[PDB]
Amino acid sequence: LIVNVINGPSLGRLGRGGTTHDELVALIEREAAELGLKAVVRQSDSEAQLLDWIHQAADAAEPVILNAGGLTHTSVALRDACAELSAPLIEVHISNVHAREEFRRHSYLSPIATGVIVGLGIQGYLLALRYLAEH
Amino acid sequence: LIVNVINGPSLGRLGRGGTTHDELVALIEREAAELGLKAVVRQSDSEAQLLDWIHQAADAAEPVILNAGGLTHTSVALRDACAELSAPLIEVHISNVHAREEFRRHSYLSPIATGVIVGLGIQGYLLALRYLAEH
Amino acid sequence: LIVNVINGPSLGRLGRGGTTHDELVALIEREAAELGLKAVVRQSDSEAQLLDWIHQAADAAEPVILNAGGLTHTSVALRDACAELSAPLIEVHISNVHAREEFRRHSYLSPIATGVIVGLGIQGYLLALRYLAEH
Amino acid sequence: LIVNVINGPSLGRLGRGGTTHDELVALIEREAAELGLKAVVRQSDSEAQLLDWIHQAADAAEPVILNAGGLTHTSVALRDACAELSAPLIEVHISNVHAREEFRRHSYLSPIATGVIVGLGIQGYLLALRYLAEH
Amino acid sequence: LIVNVINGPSLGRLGRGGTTHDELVALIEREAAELGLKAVVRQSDSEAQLLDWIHQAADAAEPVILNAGGLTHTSVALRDACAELSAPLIEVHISNVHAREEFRRHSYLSPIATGVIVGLGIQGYLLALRYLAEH
Amino acid sequence: LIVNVINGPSLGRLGRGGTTHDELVALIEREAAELGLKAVVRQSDSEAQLLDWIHQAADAAEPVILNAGGLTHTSVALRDACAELSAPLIEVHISNVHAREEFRRHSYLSPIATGVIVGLGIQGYLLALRYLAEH
Amino acid sequence: LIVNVINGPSLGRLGRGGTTHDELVALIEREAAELGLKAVVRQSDSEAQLLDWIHQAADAAEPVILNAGGLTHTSVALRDACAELSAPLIEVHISNVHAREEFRRHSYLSPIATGVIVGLGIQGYLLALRYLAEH
Amino acid sequence: LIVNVINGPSLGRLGRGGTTHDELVALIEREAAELGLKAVVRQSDSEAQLLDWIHQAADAAEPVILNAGGLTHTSVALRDACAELSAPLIEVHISNVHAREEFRRHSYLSPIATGVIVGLGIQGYLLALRYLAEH
Amino acid sequence: LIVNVINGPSLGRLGRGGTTHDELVALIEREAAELGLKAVVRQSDSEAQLLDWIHQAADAAEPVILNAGGLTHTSVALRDACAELSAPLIEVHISNVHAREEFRRHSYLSPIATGVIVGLGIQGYLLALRYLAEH
Amino acid sequence: LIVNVINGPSLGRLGRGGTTHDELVALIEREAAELGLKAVVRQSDSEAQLLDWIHQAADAAEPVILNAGGLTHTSVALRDACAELSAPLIEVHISNVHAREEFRRHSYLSPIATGVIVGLGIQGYLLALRYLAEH
Amino acid sequence: LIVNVINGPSLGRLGRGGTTHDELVALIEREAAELGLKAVVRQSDSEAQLLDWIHQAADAAEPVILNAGGLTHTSVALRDACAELSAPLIEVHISNVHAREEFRRHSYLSPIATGVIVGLGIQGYLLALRYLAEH
Amino acid sequence: LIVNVINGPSLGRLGRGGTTHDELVALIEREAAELGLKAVVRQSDSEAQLLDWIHQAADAAEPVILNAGGLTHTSVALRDACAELSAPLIEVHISNVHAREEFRRHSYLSPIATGVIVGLGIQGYLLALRYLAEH
């Protein structure tokens, strides 16, 4: 029923691609409604903030769609917290990371994720919702 | 309107996971119909067969959903043929490759793909369709 | 006399292994009393919070027992702050990191630590206390 | 006219080298005045705090002199935020990093910086100002 | 009840740090007595001698505290013999190996050990005893 | 009082960026005058020529600003000669090397330099002068 | 009872070592008869052909002796198909690969094989038969 | 007298650079005539097809000009078959591979080739002919 | 006529897999008799002991079947002594090493061996005998 | 019309292969005449000499055929000077470098060259001429 | 006055190069006499034996000429024991190791040796003596 | 009879260790006289100068003692010229390179040298002479 969408740094800057973070929340909320889900979308540049939201979803046994931004490639902490999730974890990148710098082609999160969606824009979020609806 | 779904080796063996390759074709065909698309699904263990289907989609300017199996990690040829596509290319893995052997965590295809979906089972195919419908 | 015990992310989640973080504080406090020490145990998922506690121990010339969780493998910042400590620094892992992923077998902290204890469970904390008592 | 000087962890500890962080602010402020600039100097051990100050400078199209401390070698997030700056970005290290550990000889920031100054002490800040004044 | 302490090459040279190998045996024996344990301490520069003592402890299901010296970094054989132990294995280094040459930062033994203590001097032996007493 | 500016290959080709090597000499000479310094600027495509100028500055105990061009990444000889300097050595790159090929991101000179300035154009030379004036 | 012997490229060229591929089939057939086995020996330069023969042996639960030639070092596909076999898989090289180029010292097949025989000439095939007879 | 020109995948797509594969055959045939040679030009996306043509040239002791496309970087099989050629083998790339992705800068074929021509366009084929004519 | 079977550490522990080292000697002795061979089987955890047995076989020009255990991956000495053998050397592993840790996938012995048998259990010894009988 | 042929160290030693450097000049001069070109062939063991000849060809917008000998693998300087050429640059090796030491399989020049010819002997020079004539 | 010459495995096999180990002892003894030295030459295939002889020379403050054979590349233990020597340590290889396998081009002993002599045959021993005589 | 001693950069700076380059020439000349040799000692910071002296010794079939300084680690050219020598080549380092930076532990010259002497000071030159006298 409930799905957590968690955005790391600096996804607050979407727009500043026309879509803003707020537009994104709204798109996600609408699609969620359509799927009979409730989406809790949250963004933070703070690793610790993210860890806290992840722990919460671990305790509630809620699924997570997670776009960690740059922490994806760097944070073992975040990985460890996600590793505790018992519901599904979908990792999401808007851009195709494999078309950029080699360092972006590694993720500490993918191996503990259920699955990963990259390069499909903001629609990756919606497709992740839909996966979770049909599961 | 038309979408090519291309499966490499040995996706003919799905089932032998309950879903068979034929079931998969049927699921994909149904979803495609629902999206107002036509899906041409094709499978082959032959790299050359795949290259030929890719060239065709290049000439027709049709989008491709491609699950190359093991050739994903090994074939520059396949990459080169896909690199010619002008419509979108979605790379698909049923399993989460990042949860397996390190060698599976590299793909010659991802960097030239539009995007990539891994670990969402056979539903990755359907989600890829839906991306292409809304684009 | 005073010993700082510093726990990083997500050691707040011990339990959720039966021992909780609170139990851990209590075990450490009891052992410290027994050794004629005072233990100040502190936990945070915030790197910056940890850095601040480390700086404080640097200024006070107090010893530190530090379990950085995942930041152990990733944070040069933390290393740099610890590098300032003039009293002893004992690094502690509950689990044996060398029995897990290769990435966990490197630590930015070990080379500037006095010593390191891994894989002895929560008792590593108590043994670290005892080292510091007899020194 | 306005120049942002951003210091990461643990540059609050300069002194504790005689020069303190406050002295540094004052030196920078004086030189800035001399150049007909205004310097906004800010320090934080929080990656997120830094990201926020960087985003701000991105939105204001102000130049940044940035000394990220240890995050220089570890944070893709920070890199990504700096990558958004449209004014110049000068990276600054007080010490010569190339004379220390090999891990310090890589920086996620240098490739997106305008330029880099290392090993010239606190005077690197002043020289960076002067670059920006004559540009 | 019985604990095997096994020292490899060239721990016979402790002293030649004031503490000699004999002093070490005596310190260990005293602490063991205090814990209600019996310590069998043995040293050899011969890999084969060590393997034999390890096999013996495997057959007797006795715990081992093992300081292999340089064989720690080089001997798969020793690892394989330890891998047979069913009681606990604590690996011990007197010096902090992570503060020395990079080659010393790898150990064939750590991954099959219960845990590891480095850089706490000869007291690591005593702390290892105490772990085994409370277990 | 005296400062040696040493340019390697092929900095004779500056211009052929509008600034020519001669303009550069003149800019440097003017700034030097302004600082109460004398600048001896010299350029050569010959490694041996450069080594000779470096040895001379070693014997005279004069500071060197050195832009070695491509020899920066390749010449241990040059490093060894600079290693003899007892006055300061500032390494200078006009372009930001960290924004180019990976091979340019290593320098045999940086670790023995006092400091390094890259990506600030020809102004890096002038800023290096100014460092040396205030020191 | 039935054993599949599968030869990849270009084992059709044995002879062109006196033994030809046909001689090899005959030697294998004779030894098989002697062991109370039936040997189905098949050769192809086509990866896809091989995959098909492997799938067949997977479905029939027949053991495979496989000499993949150069695909041994390059084909994840082949590995994946073999990974499906439930009967034994013996990998065979006629030549000692470890005495040749470093690239030949890796095999995608060995880790999923039951065992491997290299450098014993064509007799490796016969010894593999005999293993399978006594099992 | 006879020269084999062998083109791998997907050199059938030349044109789709104006020159088509057919034009290429014709250019090669004309130049061959001019040199007093006969050129047999053949193309295939099938590795196995190529291997067969290579074996044939091995048996006939005919020289080969070979442009393997992407198999150049990936196929040990192809290398092994070429290694059997007793006449000359010239490797040909139309594009300069060293100006592209790092993975293209390795070739399994070069070390067993007589020589290699890259980046000279379709004229590399003609120059290879001419080498073989004057030899 | 005579064949040396040499077992390193800790193959004395076979059993402690039901087959003991003694059973193994007996199996080998019986098969040898059957082949018209005499088998001298010897085991030692001492590298030096093994070297001595290898030198002896070098001087006698007798073939060796050698299972070095862990020294296989670590000992250049052993390699060097085997390199002197003029009769055949068969390397034997009971387990499939390629299915274990990456470090076990390298052997200092394979490149100087005649051939290698891994993963066929104790029957690898018997098959090695049979190779040597038919040679 | 004019083509520069530049030979590095120690191509003065051709002969001391029967062909001497002088013969080579003469062969090149004759072929050039035949093509309606003028060839300026020059050789030097001095990197700086070569750089000077390269700069000259840059200023004159003349094409270069360059055989740098060992500097090919080592000199970034030379690369940088060639990178300035606006006419074509053909890199030439007489021997097949890919059949020798691994270090020779890298070239700082290839990526900035138009194309590369290796292993065709002195005829590579003549073929390079011919390329440049038909272009 | 006294010099220890220590030979590891399998230098007992010199001859079996005409010179035998005994001849070598005699050559060394004669040269030593000539230099006014006494040479104690000792050989063993046992690492532990060597360690014991090294410890002895450490305690006696005698210089060591050491040819460790294959242990040179593999033994940290031996390195550690040599690291204790306070008199000079000369490392000796008869053969030029840098002309053989890459693995032989690393030595755990060289960095703690006074110096190293390779590839001069048995005369390296005599030259090492002479160094020690004139020192 | 004649021996060439060749010193690269910056061995002209010996002294500026008390021994100067001139002293070194004199020591070498005296020892040479004593051995019934003539020593031609030559020094240059110019790679090309060295190459010329090496070519000369190649043509004269004279032995070379060569201390290339930093070019030892960097110059393939120099290696190639030495590779032509038919008399012996002894490589000499005054300092123990294996006790310094890792980059100094590789030499392009060692593998083509007869032998190598490092860390014995200027006496390495004299010992190299003596080797060549007794050969």
Side-chain angles (χ1 to χ4, degrees), chain K residues 90 96 98-99 105 107 110-111 113-120 123 127 130-131 134-135, chain L residues 96 98-99 105 107 110-111 113-120 123 127 130-131 134-135:
Chain K
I90 314 313
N96 184 353
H98 308 281
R105 302 193 60 190
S107 163
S110 297
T114 305
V116 193
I117 299 179
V118 322
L120 301 186
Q123 227 207 318
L127 298 175
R130 179 172 300 270
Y131 173 86
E134 316 243 15
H135 274 76
Chain L
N96 184 353
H98 308 281
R105 302 193 60 190
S107 163
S110 297
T114 305
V116 193
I117 299 179
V118 322
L120 301 186
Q123 227 207 318
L127 298 175
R130 179 172 300 270
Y131 173 86
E134 316 243 15
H135 274 76

Short mmCIF file of all heavy atoms in Angstrom, two decimals, chain K residues 90 96 98-99 105 107 110-111 113-120 123 127 130-131 134-135, chain L residues 96 98-99 105 107 110-111 113-120 123 127 130-131 134-135:
data_model
loop_
_atom_site.label_atom_id
_atom_site.label_comp_id
_atom_site.label_asym_id
_atom_site.label_seq_id
_atom_site.Cartn_x
_atom_site.Cartn_y
_atom_site.Cartn_z
N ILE K 90 73.89 -8.11 1.76
CA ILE K 90 73.93 -8.07 0.30
C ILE K 90 73.07 -9.21 -0.23
O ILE K 90 73.30 -10.35 0.11
CB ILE K 90 75.34 -8.20 -0.29
CG1 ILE K 90 76.36 -7.30 0.41
CG2 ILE K 90 75.32 -7.87 -1.78
CD1 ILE K 90 75.92 -5.89 0.62
N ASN K 96 70.08 -13.32 -14.04
CA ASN K 96 69.38 -12.05 -14.11
C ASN K 96 67.88 -12.31 -14.04
O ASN K 96 67.28 -12.70 -15.04
CB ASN K 96 69.73 -11.29 -15.38
CG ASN K 96 69.09 -9.90 -15.43
OD1 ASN K 96 68.28 -9.55 -14.57
ND2 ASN K 96 69.43 -9.12 -16.45
N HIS K 98 65.53 -10.24 -13.91
CA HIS K 98 64.71 -9.30 -14.62
C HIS K 98 64.58 -9.74 -16.03
O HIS K 98 63.87 -9.12 -16.78
CB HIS K 98 65.29 -7.89 -14.50
CG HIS K 98 65.55 -7.47 -13.08
ND1 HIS K 98 64.55 -7.04 -12.24
CD2 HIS K 98 66.68 -7.49 -12.35
CE1 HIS K 98 65.07 -6.75 -11.06
NE2 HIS K 98 66.36 -7.03 -11.09
N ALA K 99 65.25 -10.83 -16.40
CA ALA K 99 65.15 -11.34 -17.77
C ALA K 99 64.25 -12.57 -17.82
O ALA K 99 64.23 -13.29 -18.82
CB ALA K 99 66.52 -11.70 -18.34
N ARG K 105 60.67 -10.42 -10.57
CA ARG K 105 61.18 -9.05 -10.59
C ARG K 105 60.80 -8.31 -9.35
O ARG K 105 61.16 -7.16 -9.21
CB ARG K 105 60.73 -8.30 -11.84
CG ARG K 105 61.18 -9.02 -13.12
CD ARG K 105 61.04 -8.19 -14.39
NE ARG K 105 61.84 -6.97 -14.29
CZ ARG K 105 61.81 -5.93 -15.12
NH1 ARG K 105 61.02 -5.95 -16.16
NH2 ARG K 105 62.58 -4.86 -14.88
N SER K 107 61.12 -8.59 -5.07
CA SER K 107 61.83 -9.18 -3.95
C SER K 107 61.43 -8.51 -2.65
O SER K 107 61.56 -7.28 -2.51
CB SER K 107 63.35 -9.05 -4.14
OG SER K 107 64.04 -9.26 -2.93
N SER K 110 65.05 -6.96 -1.14
CA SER K 110 65.82 -5.82 -1.64
C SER K 110 65.66 -4.52 -0.83
O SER K 110 66.65 -3.85 -0.60
CB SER K 110 65.45 -5.54 -3.11
OG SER K 110 65.78 -6.64 -3.94
N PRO K 111 64.42 -4.18 -0.41
CA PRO K 111 64.23 -2.90 0.22
C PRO K 111 64.90 -2.77 1.59
O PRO K 111 65.17 -1.65 2.07
CB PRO K 111 62.70 -2.81 0.34
CG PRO K 111 62.21 -3.63 -0.82
CD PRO K 111 63.11 -4.82 -0.64
N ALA K 113 67.72 -4.75 2.22
CA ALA K 113 69.13 -5.00 1.93
C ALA K 113 69.95 -3.69 1.84
O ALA K 113 69.41 -2.61 1.62
CB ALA K 113 69.22 -5.78 0.63
N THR K 114 71.26 -3.81 2.01
CA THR K 114 72.16 -2.72 1.75
C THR K 114 72.26 -2.51 0.25
O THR K 114 72.21 -1.38 -0.27
CB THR K 114 73.55 -3.05 2.28
OG1 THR K 114 73.46 -3.38 3.67
CG2 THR K 114 74.52 -1.87 2.09
N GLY K 115 72.44 -3.63 -0.45
CA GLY K 115 72.45 -3.66 -1.90
C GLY K 115 72.21 -5.05 -2.50
O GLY K 115 72.07 -6.02 -1.78
N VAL K 116 72.20 -5.12 -3.83
CA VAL K 116 71.73 -6.30 -4.54
C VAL K 116 72.60 -6.51 -5.76
O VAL K 116 72.95 -5.57 -6.43
CB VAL K 116 70.24 -6.13 -4.96
CG1 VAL K 116 69.61 -7.45 -5.42
CG2 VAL K 116 69.42 -5.53 -3.82
N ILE K 117 72.94 -7.74 -6.05
CA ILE K 117 73.73 -8.08 -7.20
C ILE K 117 73.02 -9.21 -7.90
O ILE K 117 72.77 -10.24 -7.27
CB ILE K 117 75.14 -8.56 -6.80
CG1 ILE K 117 75.86 -7.43 -6.05
CG2 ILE K 117 75.94 -9.00 -8.04
CD1 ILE K 117 77.26 -7.78 -5.58
N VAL K 118 72.67 -9.03 -9.17
CA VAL K 118 71.98 -10.08 -9.94
C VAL K 118 72.65 -10.27 -11.28
O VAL K 118 73.21 -9.32 -11.82
CB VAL K 118 70.44 -9.84 -10.10
CG1 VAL K 118 69.86 -9.24 -8.83
CG2 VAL K 118 70.09 -8.97 -11.29
N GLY K 119 72.60 -11.49 -11.79
CA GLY K 119 73.03 -11.80 -13.14
C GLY K 119 74.51 -11.90 -13.42
O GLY K 119 74.89 -12.05 -14.58
N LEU K 120 75.34 -11.85 -12.38
CA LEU K 120 76.81 -11.93 -12.55
C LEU K 120 77.41 -13.30 -12.25
O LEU K 120 78.63 -13.45 -12.06
CB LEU K 120 77.51 -10.86 -11.73
CG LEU K 120 77.03 -9.48 -12.14
CD1 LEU K 120 77.85 -8.40 -11.41
CD2 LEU K 120 77.06 -9.30 -13.66
N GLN K 123 80.15 -15.17 -9.45
CA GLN K 123 81.06 -14.08 -9.12
C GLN K 123 80.42 -12.97 -8.29
O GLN K 123 81.11 -12.24 -7.61
CB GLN K 123 81.71 -13.50 -10.38
CG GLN K 123 83.19 -13.33 -10.21
CD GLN K 123 83.76 -12.23 -11.07
OE1 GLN K 123 83.38 -12.08 -12.24
NE2 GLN K 123 84.69 -11.46 -10.49
N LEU K 127 82.27 -10.64 -5.44
CA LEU K 127 82.16 -9.21 -5.48
C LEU K 127 81.46 -8.72 -4.20
O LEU K 127 81.81 -7.68 -3.65
CB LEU K 127 81.36 -8.83 -6.72
CG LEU K 127 81.96 -9.21 -8.08
CD1 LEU K 127 80.96 -8.85 -9.17
CD2 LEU K 127 83.29 -8.50 -8.33
N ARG K 130 84.01 -8.70 -1.58
CA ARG K 130 84.96 -7.62 -1.75
C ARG K 130 84.35 -6.30 -1.28
O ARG K 130 85.02 -5.51 -0.65
CB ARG K 130 85.42 -7.53 -3.18
CG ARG K 130 86.39 -6.39 -3.43
CD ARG K 130 86.95 -6.50 -4.84
NE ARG K 130 87.66 -7.77 -5.01
CZ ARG K 130 88.95 -7.94 -4.77
NH1 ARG K 130 89.70 -6.92 -4.36
NH2 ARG K 130 89.50 -9.15 -4.93
N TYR K 131 83.08 -6.05 -1.58
CA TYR K 131 82.40 -4.89 -1.02
C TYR K 131 82.57 -4.86 0.49
O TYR K 131 82.94 -3.85 1.06
CB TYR K 131 80.91 -4.93 -1.30
CG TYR K 131 80.17 -3.81 -0.58
CD1 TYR K 131 80.06 -2.53 -1.16
CD2 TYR K 131 79.61 -4.03 0.66
CE1 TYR K 131 79.37 -1.50 -0.51
CE2 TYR K 131 78.93 -3.03 1.33
CZ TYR K 131 78.81 -1.76 0.76
OH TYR K 131 78.14 -0.77 1.47
N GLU K 134 86.00 -3.95 1.88
CA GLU K 134 86.43 -2.54 1.72
C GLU K 134 85.47 -1.63 2.45
O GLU K 134 85.31 -0.48 2.09
CB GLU K 134 86.50 -2.13 0.23
CG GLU K 134 87.15 -3.18 -0.69
CD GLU K 134 88.44 -2.74 -1.38
OE1 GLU K 134 89.04 -1.72 -0.97
OE2 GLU K 134 88.86 -3.43 -2.36
N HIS K 135 84.84 -2.18 3.48
CA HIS K 135 83.79 -1.52 4.24
C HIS K 135 83.83 -2.14 5.64
O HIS K 135 83.52 -1.49 6.63
CB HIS K 135 82.42 -1.63 3.53
CG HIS K 135 82.17 -0.54 2.51
ND1 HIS K 135 82.76 -0.53 1.25
CD2 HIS K 135 81.38 0.57 2.55
CE1 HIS K 135 82.35 0.53 0.58
NE2 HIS K 135 81.51 1.21 1.35
N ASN L 96 70.31 2.12 -3.10
CA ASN L 96 69.39 1.01 -3.22
C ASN L 96 68.02 1.55 -3.63
O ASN L 96 67.29 2.07 -2.78
CB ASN L 96 69.28 0.22 -1.92
CG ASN L 96 68.40 -1.01 -2.05
OD1 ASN L 96 67.76 -1.22 -3.08
ND2 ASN L 96 68.34 -1.83 -1.00
N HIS L 98 65.41 -0.03 -4.33
CA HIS L 98 64.29 -0.79 -3.85
C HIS L 98 63.92 -0.29 -2.50
O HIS L 98 62.95 -0.75 -1.94
CB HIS L 98 64.59 -2.28 -3.87
CG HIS L 98 65.09 -2.77 -5.19
ND1 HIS L 98 64.24 -3.03 -6.25
CD2 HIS L 98 66.34 -2.99 -5.65
CE1 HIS L 98 64.96 -3.43 -7.29
NE2 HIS L 98 66.23 -3.41 -6.95
N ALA L 99 64.69 0.65 -1.96
CA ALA L 99 64.38 1.21 -0.64
C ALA L 99 63.74 2.59 -0.77
O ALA L 99 63.63 3.32 0.22
CB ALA L 99 65.63 1.31 0.24
N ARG L 105 61.57 0.99 -8.68
CA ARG L 105 61.79 -0.44 -8.58
C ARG L 105 61.56 -1.13 -9.89
O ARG L 105 61.72 -2.33 -9.97
CB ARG L 105 60.93 -1.07 -7.48
CG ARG L 105 61.21 -0.42 -6.12
CD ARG L 105 60.63 -1.17 -4.93
NE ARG L 105 61.18 -2.53 -4.88
CZ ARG L 105 60.76 -3.52 -4.10
NH1 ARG L 105 59.77 -3.33 -3.26
NH2 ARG L 105 61.34 -4.72 -4.18
N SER L 107 62.90 -1.01 -13.98
CA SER L 107 63.94 -0.58 -14.89
C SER L 107 63.73 -1.20 -16.26
O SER L 107 63.65 -2.43 -16.39
CB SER L 107 65.33 -1.00 -14.36
OG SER L 107 66.30 -0.96 -15.39
N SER L 110 67.24 -3.44 -16.95
CA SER L 110 67.64 -4.70 -16.31
C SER L 110 67.42 -5.96 -17.16
O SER L 110 68.29 -6.82 -17.18
CB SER L 110 66.90 -4.87 -14.97
OG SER L 110 67.24 -3.84 -14.06
N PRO L 111 66.26 -6.07 -17.86
CA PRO L 111 65.99 -7.30 -18.55
C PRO L 111 66.92 -7.59 -19.73
O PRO L 111 67.06 -8.75 -20.16
CB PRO L 111 64.54 -7.11 -19.01
CG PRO L 111 63.96 -6.17 -17.97
CD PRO L 111 65.09 -5.18 -17.92
N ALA L 113 70.13 -6.20 -19.66
CA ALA L 113 71.45 -6.22 -19.05
C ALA L 113 71.97 -7.65 -18.80
O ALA L 113 71.20 -8.61 -18.73
CB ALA L 113 71.40 -5.44 -17.74
N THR L 114 73.28 -7.79 -18.66
CA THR L 114 73.88 -9.03 -18.23
C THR L 114 73.59 -9.22 -16.75
O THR L 114 73.21 -10.31 -16.28
CB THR L 114 75.39 -8.98 -18.42
OG1 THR L 114 75.67 -8.67 -19.79
CG2 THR L 114 76.04 -10.32 -18.04
N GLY L 115 73.81 -8.13 -16.01
CA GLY L 115 73.50 -8.08 -14.59
C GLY L 115 73.40 -6.66 -14.03
O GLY L 115 73.61 -5.69 -14.75
N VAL L 116 73.10 -6.55 -12.74
CA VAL L 116 72.71 -5.29 -12.13
C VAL L 116 73.30 -5.23 -10.73
O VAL L 116 73.30 -6.20 -10.02
CB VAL L 116 71.16 -5.17 -12.06
CG1 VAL L 116 70.71 -3.74 -11.73
CG2 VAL L 116 70.53 -5.62 -13.37
N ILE L 117 73.80 -4.07 -10.35
CA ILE L 117 74.36 -3.87 -9.04
C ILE L 117 73.73 -2.61 -8.50
O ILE L 117 73.84 -1.57 -9.15
CB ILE L 117 75.89 -3.68 -9.10
CG1 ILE L 117 76.53 -4.94 -9.69
CG2 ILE L 117 76.45 -3.37 -7.70
CD1 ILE L 117 78.04 -4.87 -9.82
N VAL L 118 73.08 -2.69 -7.34
CA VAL L 118 72.45 -1.51 -6.73
C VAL L 118 72.81 -1.43 -5.26
O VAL L 118 73.04 -2.45 -4.63
CB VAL L 118 70.89 -1.45 -6.93
CG1 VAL L 118 70.51 -1.95 -8.31
CG2 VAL L 118 70.12 -2.21 -5.87
N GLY L 119 72.89 -0.20 -4.75
CA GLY L 119 73.04 0.05 -3.33
C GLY L 119 74.41 -0.13 -2.72
O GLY L 119 74.54 -0.03 -1.50
N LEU L 120 75.44 -0.36 -3.55
CA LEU L 120 76.82 -0.56 -3.04
C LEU L 120 77.72 0.66 -3.17
O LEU L 120 78.95 0.58 -3.07
CB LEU L 120 77.46 -1.76 -3.71
CG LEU L 120 76.64 -3.01 -3.45
CD1 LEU L 120 77.39 -4.24 -4.00
CD2 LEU L 120 76.30 -3.17 -1.97
N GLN L 123 81.32 1.91 -5.23
CA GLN L 123 82.06 0.66 -5.37
C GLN L 123 81.43 -0.32 -6.35
O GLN L 123 82.11 -1.19 -6.86
CB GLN L 123 82.28 -0.01 -4.00
CG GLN L 123 83.71 -0.46 -3.83
CD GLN L 123 83.84 -1.63 -2.90
OE1 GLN L 123 83.18 -1.68 -1.84
NE2 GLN L 123 84.71 -2.58 -3.27
N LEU L 127 83.40 -3.03 -8.75
CA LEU L 127 83.01 -4.41 -8.77
C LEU L 127 82.55 -4.79 -10.18
O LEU L 127 82.80 -5.89 -10.67
CB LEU L 127 81.90 -4.60 -7.75
CG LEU L 127 82.23 -4.32 -6.28
CD1 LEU L 127 80.96 -4.45 -5.46
CD2 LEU L 127 83.30 -5.26 -5.75
N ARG L 130 85.58 -5.35 -12.16
CA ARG L 130 86.23 -6.59 -11.80
C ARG L 130 85.51 -7.78 -12.42
O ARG L 130 86.14 -8.70 -12.90
CB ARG L 130 86.33 -6.73 -10.30
CG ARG L 130 86.98 -8.03 -9.86
CD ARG L 130 87.22 -8.00 -8.36
NE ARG L 130 88.10 -6.89 -8.00
CZ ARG L 130 89.42 -6.97 -7.94
NH1 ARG L 130 90.02 -8.12 -8.19
NH2 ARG L 130 90.13 -5.89 -7.64
N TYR L 131 84.18 -7.77 -12.42
CA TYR L 131 83.43 -8.79 -13.15
C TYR L 131 83.94 -8.89 -14.58
O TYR L 131 84.23 -9.97 -15.07
CB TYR L 131 81.95 -8.47 -13.22
CG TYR L 131 81.20 -9.44 -14.11
CD1 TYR L 131 80.71 -10.66 -13.60
CD2 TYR L 131 80.99 -9.14 -15.45
CE1 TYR L 131 80.01 -11.55 -14.42
CE2 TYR L 131 80.30 -10.01 -16.27
CZ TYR L 131 79.82 -11.22 -15.77
OH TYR L 131 79.15 -12.08 -16.63
N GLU L 134 87.35 -10.47 -15.17
CA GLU L 134 87.46 -11.93 -14.95
C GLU L 134 86.53 -12.66 -15.90
O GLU L 134 86.07 -13.75 -15.62
CB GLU L 134 87.11 -12.31 -13.49
CG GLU L 134 87.72 -11.39 -12.43
CD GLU L 134 88.71 -12.05 -11.47
OE1 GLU L 134 89.18 -13.17 -11.76
OE2 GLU L 134 89.01 -11.43 -10.41
N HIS L 135 86.27 -12.02 -17.03
CA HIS L 135 85.32 -12.49 -18.03
C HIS L 135 85.79 -11.91 -19.37
O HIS L 135 85.60 -12.52 -20.41
CB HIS L 135 83.87 -12.10 -17.65
CG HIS L 135 83.19 -13.10 -16.73
ND1 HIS L 135 83.46 -13.19 -15.38
CD2 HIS L 135 82.23 -14.03 -16.98
CE1 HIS L 135 82.71 -14.14 -14.84
NE2 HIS L 135 81.96 -14.67 -15.79
#
